């Protein structure tokens, strides 16, 4: 019984700075700046994008950490889980 996998999703909003999202992507998903920036733009232009796909526990930890980091820096940036 292989484990269910979960997609980590970033949702676009109009107030979180692009610089910040890029930072999030490097810090919590090990993206280099270039890939991070493109990914931020995929979110920005499409409204949402998949940052990664992980085992449930890993995914839920990423999500919780990304959101906490966002609120602590007073941004509304929303990270969510989706079952793959």
């Amino acid at each position: 019984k292989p484990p269910s996998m979960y997609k980590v999703i970033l949702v676009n909003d109009d107030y979180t700075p692009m610089e910040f999202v890029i930072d999030v992507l490097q810090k919590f998903f090990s993206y280099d700046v270039e890939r991070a920036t493109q990914l931020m733009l995929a979110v920005h232009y499409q409204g949402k994008a998949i940052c990664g796909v992980f085992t449930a526990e890993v995914a839920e930890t990423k999500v919780a950490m990304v959101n906490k980091y966002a609120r602590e820096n007073e941004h509304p940036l929303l990270c969510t889980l989706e079952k793959a």
Binding site: D14, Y15, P17, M18, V21, E34, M40, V43
Partner: peptide, 10 residues
């Protein structure tokens, strides 16, 4: 998201 006027280099 919101740009701060910076260039993305991407």
């Amino acid at each position: 998201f919101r740009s701060k006027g910076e260039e993305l280099f991407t």
